[PDB]
Amino acid sequence: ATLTAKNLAKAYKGRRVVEDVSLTVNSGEIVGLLGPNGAGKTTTFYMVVGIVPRDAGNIIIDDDDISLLPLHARARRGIGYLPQEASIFRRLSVYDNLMAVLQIRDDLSAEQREDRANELMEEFHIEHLRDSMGQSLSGGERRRVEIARALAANPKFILLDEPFAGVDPISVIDIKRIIEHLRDSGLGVLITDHNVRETLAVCERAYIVSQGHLIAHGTPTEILQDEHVKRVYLG
Amino acid sequence: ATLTAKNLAKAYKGRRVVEDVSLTVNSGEIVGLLGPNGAGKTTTFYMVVGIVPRDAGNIIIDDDDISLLPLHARARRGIGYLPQEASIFRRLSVYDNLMAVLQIRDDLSAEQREDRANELMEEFHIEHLRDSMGQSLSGGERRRVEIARALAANPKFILLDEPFAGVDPISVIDIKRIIEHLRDSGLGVLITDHNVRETLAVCERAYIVSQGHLIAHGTPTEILQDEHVKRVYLG
Numbered sequence A, B: 001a002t003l004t005a006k007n008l009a010k011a012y013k014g015r016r017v018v019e020d021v022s023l024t025v026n027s028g029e030i031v032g033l034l035g036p037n038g039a040g041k042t043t044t045f046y047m048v049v050g051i052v053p054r055d056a057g058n059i060i061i062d063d064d065d066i067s068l069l070p071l072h073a074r075a076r077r078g079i080g081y082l083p084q085e086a087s088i089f090r091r092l093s094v095y096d097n098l099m100a101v102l103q104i105r106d107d108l109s110a111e112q113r114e115d116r117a118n119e120l121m122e123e124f125h126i127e128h129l130r131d132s133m134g135q136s137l138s139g140g141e142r143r144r145v146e147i148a149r150a151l152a153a154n155p156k157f158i159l160l161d162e163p164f165a166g167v168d169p170i171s172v173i174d175i176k177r178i179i180e181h182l183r184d185s186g187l188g189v190l191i192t193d194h195n196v197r198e199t200l201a202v203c204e205r206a207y208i209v210s211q212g213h214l215i216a217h218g219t220p221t222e223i224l225q226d227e228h229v230k231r232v233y234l235g
């Protein structure tokens, strides 16, 4: 129901890239995290997901501090994650890519894994790429496959690190509906992207980060005229 | 059990890189596939595992033709695979890398996954790297982690594609001992590597391929005396 990060801090050498960052995502809502290149968004995703150790802070699900849980146990509790950088298996076919994911699924039979594979391919308009290898896909084809992989894991909370990069405008609409639809079924989404228009359109609320600190919080319409935010991020 | 490949063939352009290759491994044996760079060893491995389509040939386990099964279904039937190129997750720690694989394990409870993790890390002498990230490891540390990952999947048959590249001589001896131990437990092994002396030492018999044809077979002593093998491979 509730995923909360409190007082996250991270430094490299001594560059404070995240300091005292707190945020919350509830199931059945889409929440943004936006900000300048290097502001510390991917780093906060790392700390929530469990891939770098934090300098300070706590990760909580439903009044349960899971800060000491390793990555795999946090994923078992429902945290999913789409990396920013490419993560498709380059030698595997699209279908193989999604099946490697659906292997983890103790809630689906062999037949239901099959159908879920086809279903995702049809939803993302990639069924014609079924037997294409990862390495032979175009930039947007590859990204949409990676989004489908991350969804195929059926998380409770999904952190999407720049899902729209390389993605055409029509697929960006299509993906927004896939995500809206899963939100309706209780999926919590934390999303970052620099396609600000399309991202804010689907967000119920959003956080703004800049040089490692939160500098704003609220609706799309609100964020779009916070004076600090126009100066440091929007133009 | 018995894993057989029969009459495998594969061509790219007007270059047939594998032609009429047949191989077999039984549980409880270690078998080599050796031969010049480009001879078609990795290509054969891809056809057995299921990542490249075959031009001709059949894959059989015991009395079952599994040629039509996809990669995930062949792995469920007990085919395992260590890729030649790097496959570690670069942003995960050694421990996370191991746990991500031990997630697929229906036969181990959460406590038993973690004992298997520590057990693997101590057998490969990598426990001091437990929380080091994939990308910051040396070449042989990275390779040893990749072998542990492939064995963590508990296959019935494992195809090891150049496991000793980058690995120091002491760890080579250690790895030979770890796989001889799993051989004694019923694991079948198909191994290819250019450390000829060390690889033939643990093989009971081997095949020599050159330009995609089998040109020799037999014990290590037989392989090493064959004049065809000296000329095209040993030099």
Ligand SMILES: Nc1ncnc2c1ncn2[C@@H]1O[C@H](COP(=O)(O)OP(=O)(O)OP(=O)(O)O)[C@@H](O)[C@H]1O
Residues within 6 Å of the ligand: A012, A013, A017, A035, A036, A037, A038, A039, A040, A041, A042, A043, A044, A084
């Ligand atoms: N291992 C590292 N060592 C030193 N500095 C690092 C390391 N990793 C990241 N940084 C720095 O920390 C800052 C923030 O990294 P981060 O990836 O969190 O940015 P981001 O908010 O995701 O931005 P973008 O919008 O460009 O993706 C960057 O300026 C980056 O160069």
Ligand SMILES: Nc1ncnc2c1ncn2[C@@H]1O[C@H](COP(=O)(O)OP(=O)(O)OP(=O)(O)O)[C@@H](O)[C@H]1O
Residues within 6 Å of the ligand: B012, B013, B017, B035, B036, B037, B038, B039, B040, B041, B042, B043, B044, B084
């Ligand atoms: N996609 C491709 N297109 C064209 N040629 C290819 C392709 N993939 C592999 N080859 C060629 O197939 C031949 C066999 O490759 P393979 O990877 O099977 O060799 P190997 O026996 O594994 O050699 P090494 O001992 O260097 O790993 C090579 O000469 C390679 O150049």
Ligand SMILES: [Mg+2]
Residues within 6 Å of the ligand: A041, A042, A043, A084
């Ligand atoms: Mg980033």
Ligand SMILES: [Mg+2]
Residues within 6 Å of the ligand: B041, B042, B043, B084, B161
């Ligand atoms: Mg090879």
